[PDB]
């Protein structure tokens, strides 16, 4: 009976298990070809790959013996590309087809190209607790019925907001390795609060979503501000809504009278219908820029808040008595009291010579110039998220205005992955 080593492969596309005869020397490319020859010889399998759930690994290296990878194994023959449900910062839901075997950093970059969102390295995916398709993003609707915000206005302590930051996916791993089933809702968010070349001439949608993340953070008290400041954000948002109304005037519903706007030579050369249509086309771009400029001011006022741009994680600091918070921002680390939110001590990245992570004890140790080391303990989950956040912000600070139109993803991975 030769050397029957029964291998059961589940094909997610057909919900059908299949069993094959192998010898342990048969290649990855060998078994895939055995799948198609047994199932539909007409089906397009060119997107399928083998995923080993128990080892939580794709088997993309085709020229690999089964023994080289490692009988009685449960494999899956599944499409690399799947549908991902995303909640945008504007709180609208969207659906996207992504290769669930690409590292999330590359996946996020590809999702932002689809959405025409420059600089994807400032964005990433975040997990929720417990919908059109694309190869809306320009909506920016206001908080409509009070019940929608009231249902979302459930507050959270500073320790509870820090627990949410455990859901930042590993940018150096794929969607499949991180417990994302098909049609689960992830949050696409601006993870890093250091926005490179926020240009209103070309970043209309990027600015719109960034403005929407800021808007919802403020009215849901994710970030606090004084009563006076909230009144200004409300008037700023009320202004953005009004400016948004002006961009939607058409041929009907226009008060454009060229006789009061252009020189009499134009009134005499063309009919009004040719003039006004030319005004309205130019006015659409003119009103759109006032809209973007207003959102930019909303973002900059948000940026100027004392709490702005800080991501909190539960940490047990060396020599500390209780659970406190380590705050990560674009230029500094903050030791913070987990009860009051008062900053206790700040360290600048410019004085950080290097840092390290002991993955056994789950200890981040940051070394500085002319200052004793900073050491703190996190959970195993937060330890890797914290390491990516630090390396991520460091990576962003190296971005140069030398038209460096080339993201060295290798340097990001080198800055943000200790292979856990």
């Amino acid at each position: 009976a030769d050397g029957t080593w029964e291998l059961s492969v589940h094909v997610t596309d057909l919900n059908r298990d299949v069993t094959l005869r192998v010898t342990g020397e048969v290649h990855i490319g060998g078994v895939m070809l055995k799948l198609v020859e047994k199932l539909d010889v007409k089906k397009d399998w060119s997107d399928h790959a083998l995923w080993w759930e128990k080892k939580r690994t794709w088997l993309l290296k085709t020229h690999w013996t089964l023994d080289k990878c490692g009988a009685d194994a449960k494999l899956q023959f599944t499409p690399q590309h799947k549908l991902l449900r995303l909640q945008l910062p504007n709180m609208k839901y969207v659906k996207v087809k992504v290769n669930f075997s690409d590292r999330v950093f590359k996946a996020v970059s590809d999702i932002c190209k689809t959405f025409n969102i420059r600089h994807p390295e400032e964005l990433s995916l975040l997990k929720k607790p417990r919908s059109p398709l694309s190869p809306i993003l320009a909506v920016s609707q206001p908080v409509t019925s009070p019940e929608i915000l009231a249902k979302m206005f459930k507050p959270q302590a500073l320790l509870d907001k820090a627990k949410t930051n455990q859901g930042w996916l590993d940018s150096s791993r794929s969607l499949m390795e991180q417990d994302v089933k098909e049609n689960e809702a992830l949050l696409l968010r601006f993870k890093y609060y250091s926005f490179f070349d926020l240009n209103p001439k070309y970043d209309a949608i990027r600015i719109n979503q960034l403005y929407e993340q800021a808007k919802w953070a403020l009215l849901l008290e994710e970030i606090e501000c004084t009563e006076e400041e909230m009144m200004m954000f409300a008037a700023l948002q009320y202004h953005i809504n009004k400016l948004s109304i002006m961009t939607s005037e058409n041929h009907l519903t226009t008060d454009v009278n060229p006789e009061c706007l252009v020189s009499p030579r134009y009134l005499k050369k063309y009919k009004s219908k040719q003039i006004t249509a030319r005004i309205l086309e130019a006015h659409q771009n003119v009103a759109q820029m006032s809209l973007i400029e207003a959102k930019m001011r909303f973002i900059q006022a948000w940026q100027s808040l004392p709490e702005f741009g800080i991501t909190h994680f539960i940490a047990r600091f060396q020599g500390g008595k209780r659970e406190e918070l380590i705050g990560i921002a674009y230029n500094r680390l903050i030791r913070m009291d987990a009860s009051t939110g008062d900053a206790i001590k700040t360290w600048r990245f410019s004085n950080m010579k290097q840092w390290n992570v002991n993955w056994e004890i789950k200890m981040v140790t940051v070394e500085f110039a002319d200052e004793v080391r900073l050491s703190f303990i996190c959970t195993e989950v937060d330890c890797k998220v914290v390491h990516e956040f630090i390396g991520g912000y460091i990576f962003l600070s190296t971005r140069a205005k030398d038209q460096n139109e080339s993201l060295d993803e290798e340097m990001f991975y080198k800055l943000t992955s200790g292979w856990v």
Binding site: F349, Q354, N356, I390, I394, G418
Partner: peptide, 12 residues
């Protein structure tokens, strides 16, 4: 069991 990353943007 340890990873080390030496800040590029270290001024001092």
């Amino acid at each position: 069991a340890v990873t080390t990353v030496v800040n590029p943007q270290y001024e001092g």
